[PDB]
Amino acid sequence: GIPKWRKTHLTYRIVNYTPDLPKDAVDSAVEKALKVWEEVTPLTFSRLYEGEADIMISFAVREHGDFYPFDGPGNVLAHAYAPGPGINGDAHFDDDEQWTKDTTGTNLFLVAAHEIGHSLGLFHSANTEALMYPLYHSLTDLTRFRLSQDDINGIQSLYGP
Ligand SMILES: COc1ccc(S(=O)(=O)N(CC(=O)NO)CC(C)C)cc1
Ligand SMILES: [Ca+2]
Ligand SMILES: [Ca+2]
Ligand SMILES: [Zn+2]
Ligand SMILES: [Zn+2]
Structure with missing residues (x-):
């Protein structure tokens, strides 16, 4: 069974x-991420502190030795x-590297938005434009960023209409 223990709303x-x-950048990258998955599908969510939620999005700094420590x-x-x-929704960002929005x-934003889909149920897809694509093509033109039909296909296989 695919959607997150069958739930259609998570935190x-x-x-x-x-x-x-x-x-404002880390907060708005997690918000911007969330609100874009809602722009393509009716799956819902909120962003809040409670005390360890459905999805935790936490810092990792030279501690991520559960698969691979500080690479930079x-x-x-x-x-x-x-x-x-x-681990139904648990995530980590590396402070061993320089996080940018430009x-x-x-x-x-892009790396955050990927962790959101990678927590909803979505594995790596195969369009160069896809948010679930496993390689950062380093494209400078942040005006042409858009979700692809293939990552859309996989979030649709979680919930749908
Ligand atoms: C499009 O946004 C991305 C976000 C994380 C990564 S990652 O390098 O951290 N990565 C690990 C992963 O699966 N994260 O969920 C894939 C890489 C090890 C091939 C790659 C792309
Ligand atoms: Ca790194
Ligand atoms: Ca969790
Ligand atoms: Zn981890
Ligand atoms: Zn991933």
Whole structure:
């Protein structure tokens, strides 16, 4: 069975933080992420502190030795969990690298929006434009960013209309 233990509404907890960018950037990257998944499907969510929610989004700094410790300039950036019991929504961002919103380094909004889908139930897809595509093509033109039909196909296989 695909959707998150069959639930159609879940709760997200920002407890990560960039120093390089203000909280307004880390907070608005998690919000912007969430609200864009709602722009393509009727699956709902909120963003709040409660005390460990359905989805936790927390900082990782040289501690991520559960799969791979501090890499810094290195392919693996941030993770999230989905077809799990307890890891049903749990995520990590690496403060070992430079998180950016203007294509210089680690694209904050894009990487955040991927962790949201990677927690809803979505694995890696195969369109270069897809938010679930596993390679950051480093495209500087943040005006052409859009969700692809293939990542849309997979979130539709979770909930749908
Ligand atoms: C489009 O947004 C992305 C977000 C995270 C990554 S990642 O490098 O952190 N990554 C791990 C992962 O699966 N995260 O959920 C894939 C990489 C190890 C191939 C890659 C792309
Ligand atoms: Ca890294
Ligand atoms: Ca969880
Ligand atoms: Zn982890
Ligand atoms: Zn992923």
